[PDB]
Design an enzyme around this catalytic site. Structure first.
Site, PDB file in Angstrom:
ATOM      1  CB  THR A  39      28.033  98.069  71.687  1.00  0.00           C
ATOM      2  OG1 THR A  39      28.471  98.372  73.013  1.00  0.00           O
ATOM      3  CG2 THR A  39      26.353  97.389  72.037  1.00  0.00           C
TER       4      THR A  39
ATOM      5  CD  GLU B 127     -13.237 111.297  58.733  1.00  0.00           C
ATOM      6  OE1 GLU B 127     -12.023 111.550  58.488  1.00  0.00           O
ATOM      7  OE2 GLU B 127     -13.679 111.364  59.766  1.00  0.00           O
TER       8      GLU B 127
HETATM    9 ZN   LIG Z   1     -12.632 114.644  60.993  1.00  0.00          ZN
END
Ligand SMILES: [Zn+2]
Ligand SMILES: [Zn+2]
Ligand SMILES: [Zn+2]
Ligand SMILES: [Zn+2]
Lengths: 370, 370
Positions: free
Chosen positions: B164, B58
């Site tokens: 393997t 943000e």
């Molecule tokens: Zn934040």
């Protein structure tokens, strides 16, 4: 010298191949063949080969066409007969003006003989259109013709860590019902199903096609009353299978590969093929060669690790079909194939993954010998 | 009460998720978060979280938006901070009029606290749009939060028959270079890489991400100078690894899970985590719980059959990633996982095939614990 109906030619040959594939469950030992006859830009006759001893695809198409074959083009997925009343002379007798063959007869001593005969009697002929698809349609039959060896599909079913049974021997349903139904569809297309005496003794299988386990797709092309059981072949070097095992009590024939002739009374459908010995074992290479001479095109192998490894080590496997269940059985459990003598990584059998697909909760892996 | 910009909302949240996914190689231990800020139908700010200690998604989006965030809608793939200067008050301070969150904070004691705070200060808020995708984006982090257990990917590489190594121990290149490069891409996304002392003793691996082995896709989102080595975790119950092994001489940190503290001098990047004992073995369940408390989100396991079976049997594996090479090594060769005590088929670990794909000449199988 050149024309402009290549797209139309491709459309009709593709239809002829679609028709040919409708014989794949039942034509053995004959190859799948389709025929489409086009007069003035519409299809007036179609046919495919369905069972040995029934008419060839060209004959079915000519019967449909009738008088409309006069001036028509015939598309055939395989070169017409030259002396088998042959299809070549039937095509000419009907008034076909042009013939397009996907591929030539795979026998070199007769390849091209049919096309030449049509050309001689005034027919425009060509071959090669969708050859690659015509080859794929009869893969196993063609390999048998050209090498003497039947096409060998080796089936394996195992857990995610490659295991086919607990150490206790418990093997009850590693792979799913869907996997079993998938095997049935592939079995139904095989000329023969092959197994070992050890498998018959340990499992007492029937090794048949159950029509009720087939997908609605395949059930639509396979009417129940035409069901063909693949020839069941059992390798029994020391004649240990009894006439009381389930396998020789199913419908259809059963062939035992033997070292020497068995002395007991067997059902009518059971035959013996005598194979020579290599060291102490029945000679696998010779068995396959004799089966090729007996016109056996393709073989679906259902056996244990011992025969799987023996076929692998003899270089007789053409493809692996591997069903893997989303389970881990652990390192004490039984493996997929016994490869005696293999110690170095670079000597290990090597393959190419062609196709992988979900089959119910399992996966199915198709490999060839790359 | 209802609106008509659902399609536009979906377009922007999908962009925010695309941006979030660009942090997946580097955000550990933080989750991947994206943010898109839309003013009058155009995007004026975008951001994603890249590294712990750097700004939240943000904040990056608001820095881009500047004055244009006034009256804007913010799309965030995860609920904004409530007290961490928090993102909630930064969104309000910028003049955002509406916030859409894909999902709520996964911690129940703070879930919804951010959205309420925005609502309180007059912001139109809603959550749930593309929740399922937001969950998938931080699968491992979310499972660790909700259960205390890191997400455990168990990698296996084997032949077609589950092997393997040859009986001789030779293991040199069962699987392909392409498979190794594929593992590198998945390694780079894991929080940690985990192995056993036996693997370190037998193989002397580095267990690092080599940036040069990454596909051009991933190299485009992963600048070389930001390379993050996953935390290398080594389970060493009896302190047998030496300070001279390659693993503790690579860049980045290495953590040894120990029964008691080692007495030798180790490089600065090496730390010890003391795990209690269960019977004679180091307690795997407790080790995972402590790693979860240390905020370890996801673990890529590179070890042998012994640790693979131990993790499976402790119920700690979330997914298997199985690389299968088109080779048969035979039944004397070494298996995939040791499952002591497993004798009955119905007790075997069971899975579901999710995804299967070709990887060079190999195939790769993704399974979960169904
Ligand atoms: Zn934040
Ligand atoms: Zn022209
Ligand atoms: Zn004919
Ligand atoms: Zn409305």
């Amino acid at each position: 010298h050149h024309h402009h109906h290549h797209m139309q030619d491709e459309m009709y040959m593709a239809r002829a191949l679609k028709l040919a594939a409708r014989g794949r469950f039942t034509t053995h030992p004959n190859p799948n063949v389709g025929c489409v006859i086009v007069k003035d830009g519409e299809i007036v006759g179609e046919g495919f080969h369905y069972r040995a001893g029934e008419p060839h695809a060209e004959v079915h198409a000519l019967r449909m066409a009738g008088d409309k074959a006069k001036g028509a083009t015939a598309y055939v997925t395989l070169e017409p007969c030259s002396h088998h009343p042959p299809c070549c002379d039937a095509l000419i007798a009907a008034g076909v003006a042009r013939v397009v063959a996907a591929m030539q007869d795979p026998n070199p001593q007769v390849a091209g003989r049919g096309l030449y005969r049509l050309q001689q009697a005034g027919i425009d002929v060509s071959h090669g259109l969708m050859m690659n698809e015509a080859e794929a349609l009869n893969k196993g039959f063609l390999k048998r013709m050209r090498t003497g060896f039947p096409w060998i599909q080796l089936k394996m079913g195992a857990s995610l860590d490659g295991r086919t049974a607990m150490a206790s021997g418990e093997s009850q349903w590693i792979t799913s019902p869907q996997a079993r139904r998938d095997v049935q569809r592939l079995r139904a297309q095989s000329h023969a199903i092959l197994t070992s005496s050890a498998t018959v003794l340990a499992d007492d299988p029937a090794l048949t096609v159950r029509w009720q386990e087939l997908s609605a797709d395949t059930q639509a092309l396979y009417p129940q009353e035409n069901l063909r059981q693949p020839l069941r072949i059992v390798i029994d070097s020391q004649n240990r299978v009894t006439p009381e095992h389930r396998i020789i009590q199913q419908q259809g024939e059963t062939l035992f590969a033997r070292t020497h002739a068995d002395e007991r009374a067997w059902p009518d459908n059971v035959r013996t093929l005598l194979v020579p010995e290599h060291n102490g074992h029945l000679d696998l290479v010779l068995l396959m060669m004799q089966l090729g001479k007996q016109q056996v095109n393709s073989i679906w192998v259902e056996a244990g690790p011992t025969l799987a490894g023996a076929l692998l080590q003899a270089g007789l496997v053409d493809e692996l079909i591997v069903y893997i269940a989303p389970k881990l059985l652990g390192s004490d459990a039984r493996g997929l194939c016994a490869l005696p003598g293999l110690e170095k990584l670079s000597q290990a059998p090597h393959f190419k993954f062609n196709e992988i697909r979900q089959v119910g909760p399992d996966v199915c892996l198709h490999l060839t010998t790359a």
